[PDB]
Amino acid sequence: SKLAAFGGPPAVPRDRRHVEWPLVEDEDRKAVIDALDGAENPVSTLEEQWAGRFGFGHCVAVSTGTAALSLALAALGVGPGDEVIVPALSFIATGLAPVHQMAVPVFADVDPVTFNLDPDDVERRITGRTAAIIPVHLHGAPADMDRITAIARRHGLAVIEDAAQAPGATHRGRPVGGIGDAGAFSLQATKNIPTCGEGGLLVTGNAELAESVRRGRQFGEVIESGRERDYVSYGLGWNHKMNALQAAFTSAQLTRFDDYESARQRNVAAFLARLAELPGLRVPTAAPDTTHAWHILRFRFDPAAFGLDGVRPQALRSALRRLLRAEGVPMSQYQLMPLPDQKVFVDRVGFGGGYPWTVTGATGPAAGEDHPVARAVIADSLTLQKRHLHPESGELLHLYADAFEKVWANPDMVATLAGAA
């Protein structure tokens, strides 16, 4: 009954807080060992299975989601002198991928509710140098792909979807990743369809684009089923290969995806339904005609609902974080600043001597407007990560909802803590 922050019993007991993700089964361990003793290519098997499951024409497995993005940019002819529009609220990889291919990232502000890049702001940041847009399906919510693709067609721009956080998500019934020229997925251990470590997938309907990525991931060489390696390279490449063990693991995970996905959708829906009744709590939503993957759950908190007029949203954010964490809900932030505030994008040194910015002459202060929506979202939001992804987390999320309802039953204390902070 009484708040756990002040000695009371926690709404979530300590022995019920731990969640293993990834969820490793014996089938996963066997797949890994089989791949070890099978030194019949797990990587190409995963490529085929991913493409088959999600209806893509081509799938190229690579080291990371970041490499997928950078290799896609290269395949689409993006490089020195080119600008790539990316969201101001994002994982840093989306902003770095352009830099990795010696292009300049340009940051568009996001939507206050979807948290995805605002097509209207995208349009405002187009220049003669713009070559591509990387819409992110942030947190699992598909971006406004109708508007983004329309803008791209008008200005002759490439579109690469960053679907790292949105496997299984759909836009007008279409699998994310297959709407743009190419789509990038990340198979990191924290992801909705994980690998045991690092991995990435690049998908596309374009055979030439796929071949470019296939060569680029292996020093520009052509590696054939059972032909001797001649070390002949056909262009600039990297070592962006995916490990076979990690590929085999992900193939095993895919066999349970549909079941895990069903559980997540049900569990998250029931969780958000309870939190949505709490005043000044905005649960995350899928935009109309899309489905959310629920990789991360971001909640916005309105001070008005606690009669906290004229006090900073950050003060309420802190108060709620302290209270909810004490009850045993591991509420976090995800990104402390918009990407434009990150040192790499402020200093604009890059590889050295200001490159890639030196090419465009964008060494001085950042062109265009600030990003007030990204900043506002960060100011008043907390996130839940990981725990809700496990198919058996139903009871845990029930206890989380207990904790939220409990915190909201003490509005006077919230205001006191927020008033002090």
Next chain:
Amino acid sequence: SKLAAFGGPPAVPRDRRHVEWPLVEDEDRKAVIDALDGENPVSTLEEQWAGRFGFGHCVAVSTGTAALSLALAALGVGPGDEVIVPALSFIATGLAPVHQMAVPVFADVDPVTFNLDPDDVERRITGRTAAIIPVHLHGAPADMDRITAIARRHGLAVIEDAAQAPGATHRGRPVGGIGDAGAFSLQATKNIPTCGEGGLLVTGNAELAESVRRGRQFGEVIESGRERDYVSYGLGWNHKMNALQAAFTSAQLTRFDDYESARQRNVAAFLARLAELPGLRVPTAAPDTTHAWHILRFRFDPAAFGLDGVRPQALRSALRRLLRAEGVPMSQYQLMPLPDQKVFVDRVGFGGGYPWTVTGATGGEDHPVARAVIADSLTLQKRHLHPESGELLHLYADAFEKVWANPDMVATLAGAA
């Protein structure tokens, strides 16, 4: 007995030919499984590797290529800089500068050591040179006396590409630890393998290590203590090593010197037999070094077969054919010097000629020794790495001795259309 190529029995029976590499034991399987379900394996490997080879710092990364590029970045090498690399090399050595937006400059190699010739390095230095990447190619330490002297005389950095030479020494010093930094590649094929991909960057300089540590993970500082705040302190990549691969390599490393002992005995006995054959040059460790024997490259003299004035490639092809018929998997390793590769000829790079655009290198055939070595050499890869391959290598020697007992037939093949 008769040559297999003309109907005789192969010197190497087929049931003897296959060699498992990597050599996977139950301890390797357990290490991988323990990694799945779990002292982080990456951190553990870093400590273990630094400890074995006496390095001040070890930073595990995705690949040997990333180790090289991150090292360049840490040493302040980038746009407008040139990096001298060998003309005979795996392509990754030439690409690592490009990946950090610097220009690779190719120096010719020594005809015996196959390593970058300090005499030619000296010629290649310009006002833009910032670093040298000596390769310990095939497992032979480069001339580190002269490479380090050149570097220190000219104010250049040195990054060793030690991918092919783990455990080799130069003046009793483990390779990797002599330059400003050293890079290792972990692959299934390497002397100390991983089950997939991996890389290690070693250095004595703490700040250099920290730079690489940040650079491999988006410029972030990770810790056991604090929650991940996603604050980046500069330009980074995703060049993380996988924990499973790290655990596997840790297990391999504990057995490394046991395997070394067998490997070194086996190769020495093999080369001693071949060294007796006229016109066959066995590979050697240079003075004050040991050889890791990652790849065995042999050069063949046409004069020994009375083929004076005939293209060496003709002898190379005849020997390859006859030896493979005996069951010896003789190969080439690199068909051309790196400068001949399309990436380095075209100089398009990322696009618009970068990185060359910055150095002014937007504008003949060179590197004669690298070409000569490729023209008359064959290699053995993989099979000699296994500790149990002693008898196999003796079968290979039987094959070489058979071929060398039939010089007229070698000459006939070499001279034929």
